[model samples]
Target chain A: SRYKRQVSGDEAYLEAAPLAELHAPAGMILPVTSGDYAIPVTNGSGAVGKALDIRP
Target chain B: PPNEIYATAQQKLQDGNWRQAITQLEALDNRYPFGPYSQQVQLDLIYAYYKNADLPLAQAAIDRFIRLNPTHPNIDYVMYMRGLTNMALDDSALQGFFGVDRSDRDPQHARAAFSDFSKLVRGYPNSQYTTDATKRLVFLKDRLAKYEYSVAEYYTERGAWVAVVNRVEGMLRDYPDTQATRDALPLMENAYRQMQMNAQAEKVAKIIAANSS
Candidate 1:
């Protein structure tokens, strides 16, 4: 069989984008900004840099 | 004589010595700028540079050919070669060693390659490379849309839903038939929903329902 890149983090088959909040109850407190024009936010700033493992 | 060196370079190319072929052809080109084999030498020299993987020089030769021969008989081939050269230029050289996938990489040279293929097919409809160019255009269409969709996904992570809506919509507008459209719809609908735009969110839902397989 030909190689299918789904196992890796390749976006060939993208994971559902945290759509859990979409199914949250109509009046639940949300971790992300969920109101009119609010900045939806999560993922700490240093997380991406740490993943890349930039040297000190 | 030009004929002598031309045949010499032709033999060099036939033997797959691209370096010597390129050197011979460049010398012949400079020696006889307006001789009997001028045009063919230019074409062959470009091919030699391309085979040598000296894309910068190949592209330079391609530009000179275009500038000098606006309606030359072989213009389509040169245009097609430019597209091929640029496509190679855009790929990651280190990907083989690093095994890094770059499908969503920046699209600077890819954009140029797209432009070249677009021009070759549109400007010279009956040209030799049209079939291949058309196929490449299809794949490039998806790759380009994938890049835009990746940016949309980044915005999704950042919770920049408004920008996600704008970016993904433009990508969809440009490449409506691409798989990126199907992946992007949920994000757009999410963006609209989070921004309290129920009308847009519902519309996107309708489209997504029909769009997904």
Candidate 2:
């Protein structure tokens, strides 16, 4: 499952994430975690990034 | 010897070490310019470049191969790879990131990919890759037409009726039977209405109504 490479978010979690559904839409956030939160969109792959949280 | 270096490059490719494979293959080319492995090394370099995400280099290698081996027995494979490389090169790396819709972006690479696939399909209809190339050509045509439609929509929204008509007319002319054709009709009709070309607007409306039935 890890070698399938379907999970989103950080590249490091690709191997650790659960198996993706065969027909899952792109940009779905996998349960795997990195240091940041993940924002999911439909039909997109390798399509996310990060920015600093500027809450005052 | 050339055989040893070629084997090392092959091993690196198997290991998924594309950068190292590229290095090894480059060394092989330099060391054995006219050796028996020369042509095969060039082919391998194209794959290595693609795996490394160096698309421009992949494209360059494929072009060089096509130029030098116009009648090579494996020419069909190279042409198929050329079409594939063009498709990959045309895919926008920035899509969905930051909510960008790549279908509305500049279509230079998309057009190039369409042309490459068209050539491959026309030149090698019997090749195994022709079917996939034809499908990709269809998708690319819709994408290009959608790009033109997006620009037409922008011009219409900006009250540039003449510009919208010009853009949408080209989409209708170049991409008939595409999904964009149906989408473009209304935009063209509305732009005509805004331009006070009532006769043209009514004509387009009748065509849309006729097609829907």
Candidate 3:
């Protein structure tokens, strides 16, 4: 399912992508596109950049 | 408002009746998406799924937890689950044919797994689980390094000194934290000598001797 994320404030940024299997309390996978309408990038150098494939 | 359901679910889960536990939690989540206990219940839901071997459901719950509480106090628990999931989904069958697979040998998977596991360790470095994860990460490093050693062995068995040198170097470059690389240092020099690269072998030996602690 595709979700459109809305950032509450200017400081908050969201990305778009598929979510992979990961953990929490164990601090496994970074969350993106889950619970909320946010996308996660698994392989980029940074979270936002990887999520949106955007360079800093 | 939803404590009753959670209580019931907990009872069922404790009694080893995961099916009943899941059924009740499903009701709670559907009825109260924003309930205070929803998150923790969701965590248990994941445990139940994992116990039932329902990986897809467990993965979805994990994703939900990560997304909702990226900075939650118990994120380490989340990361450990991620590591187990990785191991469950690990694809190293073909490599087994070659006597140990390079599929998991790739630094990316190990690093990724440890990356999540490390976050848990860093978050609660003193926790018992964190200690386990820390140790596992160390083991994971060796596991990956062993992959490179396996490649070197593969080359050595086939009388491929050039391949051995390249693989050994690659192992040392990325996995300097492993004992396999330490052993590979001398083996690399010997392979180089066999390949008639006496000067290169001497240079590598000197590097090993000077750098090895």
Candidate 4:
């Protein structure tokens, strides 16, 4: 499901979470999900859904 | 004995205490640089560094391993990890988890990852990790191609028709047979039309029509 969702290129703003768990910045479109009904983590970025270590 | 230290580190790794594994592995490396398990310790150290999210240490360890033992039987795995590390170097947790389209951004890491994976595929065709490396390479290529297309789109939006044409042309040439290229042909047509290059526009349009049908 991670693989399928990642390559699908579905773009949408994430739903709200706790401030500390703010998934994405405002106005940026995320590329893939762990897939709905799957684990809450993200995939395809290679950290396997952990917080990003390296950024722009 | 260094074997005891190495065994303890292996236990830590199995337990998923990557930092503890790293500490023990470093002690083993320092105490027995020429031990029978020295090479193996270095390899495990790379894995620990990666798992611990210490990418720079992971990269350095793997590069050192390859430089010291180019013919190691597991070199292909190391190479695959190299590619993976590079690919994840620029990863966005927000984008990846939320399904955001970060492919439209800079692709420096993706380019490096592609090169690393391509090396693995070309050099170790029968390697266990080769198949996975190839799949990741395809994903990276599409990401890169999409980034280029986004740049072309930016030019088009800015009314820089010539720049758009050049960007799209380069994308088509360099990344042929990709989904990005398929999208690029139509973008090229649009740019050409804007520039009053109707003949070129028509030619690109025909190619798009041919590919679609």
Candidate 5:
């Protein structure tokens, strides 16, 4: 779908999925394009996919 | 708009106008449940209450601070304030002891004070404040032990050696760590000797001597 975007991180720990698709704890360190932003995501059961910025 | 009023309220508070400060803080909390400065201002309000000698209000403020920031790095200050609240309560209780019909003259208030002091002692065992609270706890325990000794002395004078033994033993059990209890064992030993309980007297005397050593 057009809403989905490819998310890449510096470390190739896993390639098939991104932070948005991986389970990452809140306050978990995630690699953003600019730098690292601690995950403020609330859903504890969600996947960790790299943040894909959508500029409308 | 909110920032300007809050600034003005803080300025008034700084000038020692506690009533105005409380009003401002109350307005902030009421108007903006999630204001950036709302939580911090609550602590400031406690300071104002302390300055105003409105202790109950100060205690309320401190309770709010503790609820909001239980693990705040500066929690020592909150712990100290709680100690202050208990101390205030204890002081009033002691003062009331001299008045008539004071049923609350027992250790309840002092125990509350000791509980707060104990937290500081146990939580930050190495802190200078902990040392201070430890000393105060010792003092309070000694005071309470003295009260018990007086009751035991009544039994000792009445020739009720058994009652004396019971009261002294109770005192030792309750306040064994207090200095007054240290003096109490000797009194118990002497009472036992008067009652001609030689063996028990010797046993208590040995314990007292061993403790003193």
Candidate 6:
């Protein structure tokens, strides 16, 4: 009814959670500590996290 | 590594430990900046920074999210948060308490928030956030309308009648339904009268009279 209530969004909004976790192997993923090695971003759907390097 | 980091971050998030959540989220984001969890990390960072009341950080997080995941299914949520973050900065939690007629204000965040909500509805008319966005838009538009009137008074104080009238005209045209537009009617007449345009002033007075009827 009021502007306060209007802008505060809702519980469903807050209830929204992070994306599902993948069951991919931990060793396959490269961390930033792996340092500069280039990879394509499109690899996640198929190669699963190989594209985690440069998605742009 | 990233999964474990994020798991801790989620625990902090669940506990409402915004600061600690931010620490974990930020670390995870940089480590795995792009991947399956990429979008979620950026999204959670924005939410965490927002809850932490670190609005500027949340804003930066949003800008990054929008650019990297422009087509993400939950993009509307990010857009909504972006507006709220801007609003928290632009407002010192002050406007709801004491923004009255003498008038001071940056209006950047208001405009930005307004634009943010506007884009939300226009781009995602059927979004889960649409109803709230529309209502927030109403609230912001009213504030913007009042904002125009404040600037008009500033011109009036300086004896710039032309500027006063011009600004009020815009308020009326742009925010016809806002309370300030109606309340500004007397000032519009005052501006004309101060400028010695007696003819226009009387006509406006008659219009106000008819409007009240």
Residue-by-residue lDDT tens digits, candidate 2, A1-56: 11111211112211212211111123322123322111122221121211211100
Q: Could you give candidate 6's per-residue lDDT for residues A1-56 as a string of tens digits?
A: 01232222211222212221112133322112122111112211221111211111
Give the TM-score of each candidate.
0.71, 0.72, 0.60, 0.72, 0.58, 0.71
| lDDT per residue as tens, model 1, B68-176 | 6677766667777888777656543313324344457767877888888887777776654565566556656667777888899999899998799888767655665
- Displacement of residue B53 (Cα, Å) in model 6 is 1.2
Best of the candidates, DockQ: 4
Best by TM-score: 2
Clashing pairs in 2: none
> Stretches of candidate 6 above 4 Å error?
A1-56, B93-103
Worst 10 residues of 5 chain B by lDDT: B94-103
Q: Summarize candidate 2's per-residue lDDT along B1-213 as a digit string, tens digits.
A: 778887777777776566588888888889766466646788878877765666778888877777766777776667666666665554533224343435786677767777676766667676655655555566666667678878987997789999988886675456544566567778878988986559878766765665421
Model 5 pairs in collision: A18-A49, A19-A48, A19-A49, A19-A50, A20-A48, A20-A49, A22-A47, A22-A48, A23-A47, A23-A48
Please, what are the lDDT tens digits per residue for candidate 6 over residues B1-213? 877987787787776565578788778767677676766787777777666556677788878877876777777676777777766555443234343322247667778888887777676666555666555566666667668878887787988989988887776556655566666777878999986568877766664664431
Candidate 1 similarity to native, TM-score: 0.71
Give the Å shift of residue B156 in candidate 5: 4.3
**Per-residue error at B125 for model 4, in Å?**
1.6
Shift of residue B103 alpha carbon in model 5, Å: 13
Displacement of the residue B172 alpha carbon in candidate 5, Å: 3.3
DockQ for every model, please.
Answer: 0.02, 0.02, 0.02, 0.03, 0.01, 0.01
Compared with the true structure, model 5 gives a TM-score of 0.58
- lDDT over C-alpha atoms for residue B91 of model 4: 52
Taking the candidates one at a time, how many backbone clashes does each contain? Answer: 0, 0, 19, 8, 10, 0
- C-alpha positional error of residue B34 in candidate 2 after TM-score superposition, expressed in Å: 5.8
